Structure formats: C-alpha cells, structure tokens
Design a protein around this ligand. Structure first.
Ligand SMILES: Nc1nc2c(ncn2[C@@H]2O[C@H](COP(=O)(O)O)[C@@H](O)[C@H]2O)c(=O)[nH]1
Ligand SMILES: Nc1nc2c(ncn2[C@@H]2O[C@H](COP(=O)(O)O)[C@@H](O)[C@H]2O)c(=O)[nH]1
Lengths: 830, 828, 279
C-alpha cells in the first residue's frame, strides 16, 4: 500500500497519479488505522510519526521515510519489498530496459556467447542475487537496490525447446510490458532468503515440503533442513520405457553446458545433504570452465577440488592440471564426486567416435564404482552415454537441460547403489529417457507424508494445496501441528467451489473457518510477510492466486493489535461507501434492517451494534489479512483489551452478513458467515432470557414528550434467574452504580417501535449496557434476549406521529430491579 | 468525477475518502485535461480557472463551486447531475431513508391508504418532480435538490402482482442498499426533461422512437412530437383468445384505482396527439377522487370539465355536480371524453348486481357512441364490464393495472371507429383478456419503420438496439440521417460477440467504427450530457449496459475541443502505468518494440510517436466518449496538434499487437478498423524505393566516426525530375525553421547488426510538419517503416557510449540524388 | 431396456421404431448378456427362454412374455415398471389425455368443485394408488395398470399461489408433452410401496432418513419405522418474526380445506408414531 512519509517542512506538491495525503497528531495506532483505510495506491504522510510507520510496516504496509525528495521520492514510483528491520528497499522494476540491457542473477551466463543472439546493441549485465550489485545506482537515505531480473525469461527459453532467442526475448519482453508486475514471484525470493536463516537459527529441526527449482540456491548453506520433493527417476523404472533411437534436438542457441553441470552438482549436494546433514567436500573431474562455482559461493562457502588440463578459475584448489585416472586415494571420506569426462570430438567417422565415447563411458562408470567402494559417507555423479550397459537398479537418473539432446545422461550413485542388483539396459531405453524426459527439479527427495510431526518445524510454502493431495489430511496437519508455516489456496470464488484450476490443473480451496487451529495466525501474504519483518508496496487483489498463510505456534499470536491486525479492513468498504453506493449510510442502514431494527432507522449512524465482523465477512477477499478468528478468540479471554464488546454484537454482524450474501447470491460469504457465527457460539456459551422473570429498569425525573402511560421507565435489562441469585444481581448492579449514574442520557425524538407502541429514543446508554451484559454473562446470569436490545422509553400503546426536539438530557432518579408481572420491586438504589 | 473547486478563502483540507487535489496557473487548457486524467472519484480544485471548470463541465464532468465547507462540502459526498447552464444540482442520494420515509414524485399517491401498509412509524412524503420540494432543505451557494425517489418500488409493486406491500418495500430497500446506485435510471429522468423542450423549440419536427411508461409525463405538453411505440391491442385480435371465466385476483393492498384512471386518460391524450397534432379539451364523467389532475397539471395545462354527483375533484372546472346522462351537446368538438360511471354497488345479490353493471355498461357504451357520432376531432374512452357485446373491430382495448382483476376493462374509440365494422365478442373472451393482459404502456402508437426521414429530428432513446430490429436498417438510419439523436449498445465484450443479453433478451452491439457518419458526434452518455448543458459526477463503468450516443447534424460538431473531447483519455492508462505496471515506462517501451524501434530504448521517454490514439483504442471501454473518428477527420481537413498520419497508423499497429497479446478481439478489430479509416481519409504513399533524399550536415561530431561523410538523412522521397523545383520551394518555405530547431545528441547506439549511429533529438516535430507539407503538395515523402533520426557513424558493430547533451552545427541542408554524386541544392 | 419375448410361432413382424431382434439356443446367461448389449430401446425376443427372462429381470431389464400380440404388444409402446415376482405391469403413460381427463391418486379431490375450472368438457377420474382401479382397462396375460397420474400438477398448483387453474393445467400439460417422461418420480412410488413392507418384515429396526411429503401415505401402516426429517416450527422461534397485519391471499380457485385437514391429521399421526411406536 506504499505509504511514503516525507518531511512536513518539505511538503512538496506534485500531481502524481493514485496519490493521497494524510497527517494527524491525535493517536499513533489510529493514524495507522486511518491510513490503512485510504483507497489509493500511494499515500503521502506529512506528520510522519515514526511509531505509525513502524505499525504500518508490522502490518505489511510499506512505510518509509523520504528525505531526498529530488530523487528518493521520484525513484519510488514503482513497487518494492521493504526489509524494515534492516531498512533496505528491494525494487521490483523493469525500467532498466531503457538501458538496452537484460539483467540476470547468475554470473556464469556472462561467459557464454549469449550477447550475440540478443537484439542488436543489447547487453546482459549481472546484478547479483536480488540486485545486490545495483546498490551503486541508488545512494539514498536507505540502502536501495533493484531486485528485478530477466532470469525467468532465460530459464523458460532453456526449458522451452524453441530455438530462436531473438524473437523469444522480444516476445517475452513485450509480454512483460503488457501484463501486470509479477510481485509474488519477485518478493518471494526476498522472503525465502530472509525466512529460512531465521528458522534455522530460531528452531531445532526444519522440514521444507516441496521445494522447487527456483530456490535451489536458497538451501545451499542449510544442510540442517530436511527437504521433501517428488520422487527420483530410478533405473528400475526404465522397464516401462519404449525403445527409441538417436534424436538430435537442439534446444538453445548459446552453450548451456554449464547450467547442466551446475544443476548436476547441486542435485548431488542436496542428495548428500538428505543422507548426511553436513556440507560435503566437492570433487570434480573435467568441468574445466567451472564458472558457476562463483554463483554457488555467493550462498555458501565450499571446498572445491578440480582435475582438468585446462584452467578452472574459482576452484578452491586445482589439485592437478593433469588428468585423473588412478588417483582414487587422494579422495577424502566425506565427499561427492562429479565425473564429466569427454575425451574429444575427434575428426574421425561418427561410428569410430561413438566407440571411443562408449569405452570412455565405461571407464567413467568404473571410476565411480571404485570411488564409492572404498569409504563410508560419500556420493557421486557420472556422465554416461546411451549404450547397452548394466547399471544398478536403485541408482538415480539425471538429464538436466543441455544445449543439444545428443545421447548423454548422468547417473547419481550413493554407496548403497554400488553393491546392489544390476540390470542390463539397452541403448534404446536410455535414448528414450534422454529424448522424453528432462529433469524438472534438482530436489530428488522422497515425497512428504502429510502427518503432524512433534519435533519438526514444517514449512509448506506452495506445495500442499493441490488437486491430488488428501484434503482432510491437509486440514488435520494445519489443525494439529505445532510450529509450522503452511500455505493454502483461499477460495475467493463465489458459489463456493471447492477446487479452482487452470487447464485441467486444479487446487483445493479453503476458507479461514475450514480450520480449527488452537494457537495460530491465519493471515495473508502481507500479514505473514510482516510477521517476518518485511512489508510490500502492493496488496493482494481480491480475484487471484491468493493464498492463506498459517503460522502455528508463533511468538506473535498474542500480539493481537501488532501483527495480522485490522489494518485495511475498511479500505474496500470506504471506497464502495463513498463512490458507488446509493448512500453513505447504506451500511448502518442495511445492518439495522438485517437485524429487524427497521422500527426506526433514524440516525442510526450513531450507536449501531454490529462490529468489525461485517467487513471481515463481506470483504474477506480484500481484508483476509485480518485473522478474524484470532481477533474473536483473544477478545473472548481478556487475559476486550481495547473494545470490550458483547458477543451479541458479533452475532448481529454475522446475521447481517448472511442476509447480504443471500441478496448478492455470494454462496461463499454465506457459508463463511454461518461458520463464523458457529465459532462465536462455540467460544461464548451464550444464553437468552426469552422468557424473563425479572428485569432491570431505570426511572427518569423529567420526560420531554407527551406520555400517556402511568410509569415512564427504560427497561435497561431483562434476565432469567432463580430467586437465590437476586443478591448476586444486586451486587453486580452496585459494581457499576457510579458508572450507571455517570452516563450522559439523551433523547432527541419519538418513534413507533411496533404496531400499537409509541416510544422515545434513548441515547448514550448502549456502551454501558454492553459492559453490564459482559458482567452478567461472566457471572453465569442469563441476561439479554434473542432479539436485539433497543433502549426505549415506551410512551403510549397508541399509534402516534413522530416528533423531534433538540437534544435534551435526561436525568436518572432511581435504578430498580423488579419482578416481571409483579408490582414488587426488589431493589431501588438512588 | 466530482470536481469540487474551493476558493483560497476555503482552502481548508480534510481527509475525505477517495479524495484528490489539483491546482495550477501555468497552463491553459491542460488544467482540465490533467484533472480529467486523475484516478479517484472526488477531486478538489484549489487555484481554479473558471475556464477549465467550464471545459470540464462541457465534457460531462461535474465541476462545482464550493463555498460552504460546513454544509455544502459535507453534503456533496454523493453523486449528482449538474445543470451547469442554470447552475442547479440534482442529488441522487437515498440517505433520506434515515427519516423513516418513502419519497414519491407523484401527488395522487399521498391520498391513498398507502401509509397504513408501510413499516410501522414510516411515512410517505411527497417530493417535487425531480425533488422540487427539497430546495428548501438545502441553503447553498447554488440551487440544490434531491432527485432520488422510491417510485421504482411502488411501480414494480403495482406491476408485479405481489400482495404484501410491507415486505415488498422492505426487501426492495435492502436491495437498494446492497446494489450500486441506479444513476442511468435517475439522471436520465433529468436528461429527458431538459432534452425534449430544447428540441421542440430548436427544431421543427420531432419524432420520438419507442417511449416507455417511465417518460409518460414528459411528453404531455408537446403534441408537436410524433411518437412511435409497440402498437395497440385491437378488438380484431381478440379472436385468438381462449374463453375464460371471472377470476378475482387482488394486486394491491391499497386502492390504486386512481392510477388506472390516470393511465387511461393519458393513453387517450397521447392517442389524440397522434391523430390531430394539437392539445384537446378533457371531459370526464364519474372520476370522484380527481387528484391525479394535480400531477398531470404540473407538466402541462389542460381544461378539465367533470360531471360528478355530489363530489368535487381537485382542479376540474365542475360544469355540473349533478349526474351526467344525456348532456352530449355540452361537449365541444375538439375534445376527449373519459366515461368512468361510478356504478355504485350495495348489499344486493351478486347475480342481480352483475345485471345492474351490465345495464350500466350498455348505457356508457351508448354514451360514447353519441359522443363520437358528431364532431370532426374527438377521441373517447369508456369503462365496460365483461359481457357479451358488439364492439367496433378497430377499437383499442386498455386494461391498465388496477386494485383487483374484477371483470372490468376500458375501450378506446376513434371517430373512425364508430363508422367501422362491429363484431360480436363473447364474455369468455373478455374475461380472458382481463385475466391474462395488463397494458404495459400508455403509448399505443404504431411501430417506427427504420427509414431515414429528411425533415424530422428523430430521437431513439434506448429503443433501436435490440435483437429483433434489423441491424443493417439501424446502421443505415444512423449513417444517412440529417438530424437525429440515436442510442445503441456498445460492444464492450472482450471476445468480439455482436450480441449481449440476459434471460433470452438480447441486444445488438456496435463499435464506433461500425458507422460511417458524415457530420456526427459518436460519444458516451457523459459527452451527450455535456452537449446539452448537463454534467455528471461519475462516468460509466466499462462493462455495464453502456450505450453509444450518436448526434447527427449538430451545431457542435466542428467545436472539437469543447464537446466529446479527449478528457479522460489517459485516466485508466495512467492508473495502469503507475500502480500495477511492470514499469512506469511500460507504455512507451511497448509502442517502440511493436513498431520495430527495439534497436534502442534510450530516447523513448522523449519524442515517441502517437499515443493519443493508443489509449483511445485499447482503453476504449473507459474513454469511448472520445469519438476518435471525428478527431481523425477534423485533423485531416483543418477545421493544432499538427500530427503526421503515419503517427496515427503506428499507434494502430501497436494497439493491434497489444490486443493480439491480450486476446482482446474487440480491440483488435477496432484497431484494424481505425487504421482502415486513417488510410481512407489520408491517401498515404510511401517512398519504399527511394529516388532522392534530404540530408543535413554538421561540423561537430562528439564521437569517433569511421564513415567518410557523416550526415543526418532527414528525408526520403520518390519524385519525378519535373517536381525537383517544387520540392525546393517547400524546403525554402521552412528554411529558417529548419535551422531554428535546437538539435541535440546524447549517446551512440546500434541501429542494426553492423550499424553504429548516434541518436538525434529535437528534429522529429519539424520532420512531421514537413511531412504534412509534402503530403498536402502530393509529393511522395517518407517510408513504410518508422523514421529514426540518426547520424550513421560506422558499420563497425561497436558498443554504445553516452555523453552530455551536445548541440549540433547544421552547417548545411541539401537535397541529393540517391546513389548520385549530384546534390541539387545546398542552402547556408 | 424393455425386452419383450413373444412366441416364435407367432413371430409377427412390423416396423416399430427403435426395435431389435434376438434369439438363440446356446446358453441361458449369455443370451441375456448378448441381449443386454443391444443398442436400441425395445428388443424382440423370439426363442424366449424363461431362464433368460428371469436373468434380465434380476438385472433390472424389463423382460416379459407377450401372448396377445394384437393388444398386449401394441399397448407396450410405452415405458413401465415391472414387478416380476408378482408379474404386474405398471404403465407410466400419459396417453389418457386423449380421453379429455386428468388422473389423480386421491379420492377426496373428486368431491371438490374442481371440474368447473378445467378446460371445457374435461373431467378428472380417480384411478387409485399407482392406478389400481385401472386394471379393468387392460386384461392381458399379466395384471396390468397405468401408474401415471397428474397429481404432481395439482400439488404444484396448490403450493404455487398462482390463481388461474385453467391456464395452469394447460401450461403444465403442454410442458409434459414437451419434456421427457419423469421415470424416476413415477417408478419410485412403486419402489417405495414395495420396498418398505419388505424391510419392516425382514428387519428388526428400520430408520428412514429425510422422508418427503410425497411418501406421506407410504408409512401410514408402519409405525415401527423411525423417521428423521427437518426440525419442526416451534412457538419459541416466533420471537425472530417481524410483526405483520392481516393479508388475504387466495391460492386456489377450488376449496382445498380438506387437503389442509388431511395434512394436519397425518402430521399428528406421524408425531404420535415418533413418540409411541403404535397406531
Ligand atoms: N459497531 C461497530 N461499528 C464499527 C466498528 N468499527 C468500525 N465501525 C463502523 O464502521 C464504519 C467504517 O466502516 P464502513 O461502515 O464504512 O464499512 C465506522 O464509521 C464505524 O461506524 C466496531 O468495532 N463496532
Ligand atoms: N494524449 C497524448 N499523450 C501522449 C502523446 N504522445 C506521448 N504521450 C504520452 O502518453 C502519456 C499518456 O499516458 P500513457 O498511457 O502513454 O502512459 C502522456 O503522459 C505522454 O507522456 C500524444 O500525442 N497524446
């Protein structure tokens, strides 16, 4: 929501688009609330309270100080992710195209002949992970960098098997200008990099479910984490494959053999991590260029040993420029070995070269076998070619994207693999694997069993909510797990559809009430981002791939007003109320008509009994960052910290939301409202004195209207009690005697309350009524009725016309407790 | 958008919701444009020029003076329609429900026992037509009134055969709070009343197509207007009806017999108007309550002479308080007669009572016959009951909604009807008509045949666009009419579907290019509202039931910048470019990549080709008030921007690419259609095979150059030798201007593989002015591709270098034979 | 799937529409299988194995012997439900409209002035529950009756609050000719009436979940069954209701006070059944 606070003295004015202006010196939390309810994208903050900036940032709303209006202000007309703890700004902005450049996260790409295939004059410039090397471009009051890169395009080109790069880059850039900004993808890079270190330091055992190739670099420094992904391609599974012949498909114009090498070595690193939770020694044979080491070293320090006749720049120690044949004993006991040996494309016939390469393949495989036969705790990966050969059945198969699909694959072998059953594999099956399979993911770990773990911190970022996963197992995991961070699809669909999908790929959808979590925060990406110290320029759109984030066993659950608060609950409510609606009063109007309070709708903008629940039910697709359930619960057990609202006040908003949904045919909001009302009636064991025996009544000295009944009284309470509780009731009355006479009782008009009932309004007594309802309910005394409480002084049982007077205070003369249908009053304090 | 202008004295500011602020005195017409491109609903204007406030109001955008911050400002946080000519404000706001009241614009309703069936304690409060009686409530710098009424509910209740009013009103009120404000419905009530008087005065002959019961009162004062509706129910058509018996269905809890009487009389008035184009005398018999006269008299004066026993209507000149039996000679020759004979009942038998009513009906029918036997100009309406009887074949049958369906109907009779064939009609058929039909419309006039009329001002207000009307007949009417105001549904669908519909009721959809109008304004409801002196606080939502408005042959067509202007062209463009976009430069970047200007993206924030058209094509669902067609045409034949035609074509190609990427089929069509219109209006030629060229030479070149002769190729042309002199003339015509331009260069870049050039700035505007001069003089200038001003430096495929802004020498300008050593001119 | 087996000697031939022909003497279960895989609606069975008819009937496929080709065969060009244990044929067929008549399951309706509000000349004729009194119309090799009635229309008119019966009946009849036959609704009446007696006799304790008003008559003789439906309207729940005044809405042209009385008494019977499992 991009709130920018600039100095009041330097309150510069320009007509920027979608801007707003706010400033006030009354409270520090309500300035944040009122800012959170502004309707535009950018907000300009002029009294610039540091406290209020911190509150916004905790809520996920980006709030930063602006000191160099000349450049700081103008260079923030784009979205960004703000690390407010370290005061860092990560710009997600593709204006750098005006420099005729493509930006990448990876250094190795700069060494390929990629620039030739770009548009004429274009270059690609390395920017570092999340634009770390761009900090020179921006020298502001804060550290500033541009996290936007074109790496998605390059990776898509590599996996797309289409050849011509010029048109591909051009098409993808034009598309990027035609579609809205990929905020989720770009800010999640920052969130991953900040999140997982905090978890590894802060928690004993961290389990990450379904990592994707995007974060392959994130976990390079954290072997403590146990990863669960899709299964690996085993050799035994090649029995199903139909035999095929050589097929020379070219996928990339520029040589990407280094990307293949890097994905291979990283896959091996993570296999080793999965087996032994420690960082291994890396041994590499071949891999002469080896530039990508740099990109790995940016995330974790590793010890690299290289054997290649050419030079390898970034290696730790290039043990020998000479080739490696029988030097097995140099290899230490806790390590991984990458064997990429290609002798040479000789200038001989292709058949002769094939025999040469086949013999070389057998040599490499035997080298791997000797590597793993001698020593415990090691893993290896070999380059083989497609031929008839006998591989172990449990070995893992790798074919990552390479420049051309030309009869090569890789075999990943642990020590359990070497002495295992070996099977004969024809060249046709291996060719079928090379041609029909491209390895999608470097995480080859066994799938995650969706069971609650008591010693683990489970992290399911975008993996659990899928069409094929068991829904009830997901619900039980979220419900009963301690210490977790799990994400599901939101079900922002009308008609309450239980799945949502794109081109026959579907996801399960959940409402916040579909869970029964005891102690957890159920918020948006904004809320979860704030809980971990980040804020963002751009909120979730109501219709999109929006996810609920659920944090189980968090430090922050009891900080109700601090994290996943009601910031922005009324942003959409206010936009609709002031632009499109029939009247700005429509809300109070509808809420009173929904609770059968139509008897008078006269100036109901004052002292309405409905609550936050109405906007959390109706506009949930916008403000689901609120966590309505925790808000209700924490106010059940004070341990009402700011509000002290009676439960009937919550139930009334529930009923109003149900009627609204039925009018709009919003089936989802109808369910959500019914379920929240159920949760309320579970947390509060509410009772209704629909058949009362006694009542509390207030009597006034003067009555500014013509009255036709003998006794004008305000029925201020109605209750159902046994006689023995009359002292208890009395005590509770005494408990607020001061407060009872303190209230500023006012009346301004008379109206018809029902057929044959003519009453005078009473104002200013309702807050006291709710405090007293809370006290009676806490004391297990049945107080209140099924209907809504309407404070009124009955004037006559006749049908008379409405009369108005100026606000005339009313004065209390006695506050009595009387038995219904008994002329006997059982208490009369003055 | 509510534009609210506050004075320096009232420069007070609060945090109003969805608010914005603008103010400036360094620009003239651009203050209105820049206001028109702001994103929120309400805007506050602080250092305001009266001129730009007027420009906004002419464009349809409501712009009001605000002086009473205490009440006037707080009470304009709701939408309204503003008559800026008379400076009056019609509020459309239903906050008045907080008074426990139902508001009607009709006085007769107040006399019924309707208040009894409302919610307890609620009242019904008569308000003036379009809230005339609310002006007392508001004491502002301007006239102010609240046009919102609950008549939607009352009318729907009467026509919906729902029984219980209390629940119906309650449900409809809740619905009204749950759905957005019916602005089209409410403000068109104002628009009709301002429109049609202006048309009657300003034009001789006015034809109104398909009026509905909503505007029943509007045309009461204009028999000059000839209206065409769906048609009448004739007695001749009762042969189809299957015989039925009495079925006593109750329609309303409170007596609405006065609505029936009024609708009958009004139907008769409009029939009389249809036959003889002049206002009649009104004679009525029975009609004891007589209030609806008031509601009629508020729009037009009529002469009301009623005969009613011992009862006194409202304003009827009571020719006799005695019962009327054989006084036919008292009734004048230019008149209308309504025969509602009370027919009072009693406590007698229902069968005997039926015979009583039958005899009374026969008396009434003979009464009508005696009325019509004489006279040159008369029309009559009679109350009958269901019985066997012989009615004229050409007579019209009326059954307007009444309290109960109790064996009663009304017959409309012409002077032509009496002298026509009479046919026997059984009681069963009459019961079938009473039970199965309620007359929907008081205009029973024959339908409009969709043919152009040359002497008439035709008005088709939401009537022509429909599934069943001939689409090509509509296109020809709009295209070839001389003086009309016609509305059609706009094709705001993403897939190019030519129809749009709900529950088997469909409408044809058109694009602005689907027409070929000669001199006409094709704009939105806002634009049309502005042309007639009204403005509105909030524009139409892009995917609503939005209508194109076409005004043929108006005085305002040539006033381009005043009406149907470019206000709001970039409102959505600016919201998208900031906010959600990948980059704030995204627009210029995409137009340069789509027109093959990808060689460099450096010099594109400055000196880009057209984008005025770009946002009018792709964001058309928002700014369809622009009328891009007249804008293109008027700039072909001057009658400011001085924009080259290729400049428009490039934006067309960019919009086509954008639509193809978004799969916006309608925008793709619209873009291709506009490019077609451009190449139609401009007979463009391209010198793709160059013959000669214009070259500029400078002494200073801040970069290392590896070519022998550095020059800026400022032109390419295909010409005959005989035309070489004329070209020189044009060069001389702006020689000063050519050396005058402040040409600047800032960096070097790659223009293609193996080409290394330096950017050029400040020459492009001169290039377009000169292109216009070449095209006007029928000399082929320019190329199919886009013009890129550059000085070739080398064919060396070298890396790009940047320097500070360096001016250029312009030592010489010249025209040289391409591939020839011959230069044919070289001015100092 | 309407398999009709007729005598091989009397193998009459006509070009009926959607018919088929099968006959074989190799196996008794595979003749049933091969018949079950034929594609048309009606099948004509010529070697007419009694065993194979029983197998089909056990599978749900109607399989009946045809002996009076002249009328039995032609009066089976309509769908039906076949009680193959008792050899009874319940026709679900609305051809009886050609007799200018409306058929009802309930005797009380005949005492109301309903016939006046029909189309001219039309009558309503009581036919008994699932057409028990229609067995006189059909005297075939099997017991035969027409279970089709217009009672759905009358009940819908009573609950629809629209007044004019003539147009309502006409509209609903025209609709019935324009839409396919409501087989599920009509055969489920027969299935309920056969099913629940078998269950009460065959099982100790029978629980029926969510009975609807349609089968209000089915359980009149079985108080052993415990029924579970939607909750009742309690007096205490009137506290929520908004106060209103007299509103005289007329829902039916002919007096249906007897339907009200019957529904009241039957509701009371079932409440008593729910409390005390006896009549
Ligand atoms: N009863 C009640 N009303 C609230 C509460 N919070 C906000 N509101 C009402 O909601 C309004 C803003 O939300 P809106 O009605 O515009 O959606 C405020 O002006 C206030 O009257 C609450 O906790 N309880
Ligand atoms: N209206 C208009 N805008 C132009 C024209 N040429 C360039 N522009 C640019 O287009 C912007 C309008 O918003 P856009 O959708 O291009 O972002 C203006 O701010 C301006 O910088 C033109 O001829 N007409």
């Amino acid at each position: 929501m991009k709130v920018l606070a600039l100095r009041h003295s330097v309150a510069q004015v320009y007509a920027d688009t979608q801007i707003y202006t706010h400033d006030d010196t009354k409270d520090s939390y309500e300035n944040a609330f009122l800012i959170s309810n502004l309707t535009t994208h950018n907000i300009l903050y002029f009294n610039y309270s540091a406290r209020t900036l911190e509150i916004l940032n905790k809520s996920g709303i980006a709030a930063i100080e602006i000191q160099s209006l000349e450049e700081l202000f103008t260079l923030i007309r784009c979205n960004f992710t703000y690390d407010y703890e370290n005061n860092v700004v990560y710009l997600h902005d593709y204006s750098y195209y005006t420099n005729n450049e493509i930006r990448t996260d990876q250094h190795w790409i700069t060494k390929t002949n990629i620039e030739e295939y770009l548009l004429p004059g274009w270059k690609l410039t390395y920017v570092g992970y999340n634009g770390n090397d761009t900090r020179g471009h921006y020298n502001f009051s804060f550290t500033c960098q541009n996290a936007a890169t074109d790496d998605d395009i390059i990776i898509e080109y590599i996996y797309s098997e289409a050849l011509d790069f010029q048109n591909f880059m051009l098409r993808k850039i034009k598309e990027r200008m035609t579609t809205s900004l990929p905020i989720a993808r770009l800010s999640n890079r920052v969130f991953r990099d900040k999140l997982f270190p905090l978890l590894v330091k802060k928690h004993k055992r961290v389990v990450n479910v379904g990592p994707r190739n995007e974060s392959m670099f994130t976990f390079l420094n954290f072997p403590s984490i146990r990863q669960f992904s899709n299964g690996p391609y085993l050799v035994k599974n090649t029995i199903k494959l139909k035999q095929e012949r050589w097929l020379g498909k070219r996928v990339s114009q520029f040589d990407i053999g280094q990307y293949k090498n890097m994905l291979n070595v990283i896959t091996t690193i993570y296999h080793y991590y999965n087996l032994y939770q420690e960082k291994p020694i890396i041994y590499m044979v071949g891999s002469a260029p080896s530039y990508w080491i740099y990109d790995v070293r940016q995330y974790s320090d590793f010890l690299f040993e290289t054997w290649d006749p050419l030079d390898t720049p970034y290696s730790s120690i290039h043990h020998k420029e000479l080739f490696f044949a029988k030097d097995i004993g140099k290899l230490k006991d806790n390590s991984i070995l990458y064997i990429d040996i290609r002798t040479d494309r000789g200038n001989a016939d292709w058949k002769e070269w094939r025999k040469v390469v086949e013999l070389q393949t057998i040599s490499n495989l035997n080298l791997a076998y000797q590597y793993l036969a001698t020593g415990k705790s090691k893993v290896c990966c070999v380059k083989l070619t497609a031929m008839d050969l006998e591989l172990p059945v449990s070995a893992k198969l790798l074919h990552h994207p390479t420049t051309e699909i030309r009869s090569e694959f890789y075999l990943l072998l642990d020590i359990w693999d070497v002495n295992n059953i070996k099977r004969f594999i024809p060249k046709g099956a291996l060719y079928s694997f090379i041609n029909n399979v491209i390895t999608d993911n470097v995480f080859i770990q066994s799938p995650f069993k969706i069971r609650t773990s008591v010693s683990d911190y489970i992290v399911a970022l975008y993996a659990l909510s899928n069409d094929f996963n068991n829904r009830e197992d997901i619900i039980n995991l979220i419900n009963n797990q301690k210490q977790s961070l799990i994400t599901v699809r939101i079900n922002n669909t009308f008609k309450d559809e239980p799945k949502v999908g794109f081109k026959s790929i579907y996801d399960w959808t959940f409402l916040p009430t579909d869970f029964e979590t005891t102690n957890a925060i159920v918020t948006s990406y904004d809320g979860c981002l704030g809980i971990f110290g980040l804020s963002i320029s751009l909120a979730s759109k109501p219709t999109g791939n929006n996810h609920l984030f659920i944090l189980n066993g968090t430090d922050k659950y009891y900080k109700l007003d601090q994290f996943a608060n009601h910031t922005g609950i009324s942003r959409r409510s206010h936009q609709v109320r002031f632009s499109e609606s029939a009247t700005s009063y429509s809300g109070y109007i509808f809420r009173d008509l929904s609770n059968s309070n139509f008897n008078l709708i006269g100036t109901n903008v004052e002292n309405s009994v409905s609550g936050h629940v109405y906007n959390a039910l109706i506009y949930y697709r916008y403000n689901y960052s609120f966590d309505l359930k925790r808000w209700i619960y924490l106010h059940s057990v004070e341990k009402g910290k700011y509000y002290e609202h009676a439960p009937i006040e919550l139930i009334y908003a529930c009923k109003s939301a149900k009627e609204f949904a039925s009018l709009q045919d919003d089936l989802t909001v109808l369910r959500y409202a019914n379920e929240i009302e159920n949760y309320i009636n579970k947390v509060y064991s509410i009772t209704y004195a629909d058949d009362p025996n006694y009542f509390i009544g207030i009597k006034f000295n003067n009555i500014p209207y013509i009255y036709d009944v003998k006794v004008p009284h305000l029925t201020f309470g109605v209750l159902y009690i046994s006689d023995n509780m009359i002292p208890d009731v009395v005590k509770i009355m005494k408990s607020m005697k001061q407060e009872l006479f303190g209230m500023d009782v006012t009346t301004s008009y008379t109206y018809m309350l029902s057929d044959g009932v003519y009453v005078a309004n009473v104002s200013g007594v309702l807050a006291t009524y709710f405090k007293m309802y809370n006290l009676f309910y806490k004391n297990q005394i049945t107080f209140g009725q099924s209907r809504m409480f309407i404070p009124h002084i009955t004037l006559s049982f006749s049908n008379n016309k409405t009369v108005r007077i100026e606000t005339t205070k009313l004065r209390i003369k006695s506050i009595y407790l009387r038995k219904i249908r008994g002329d006997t009053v059982f208490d009369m304090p003055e």
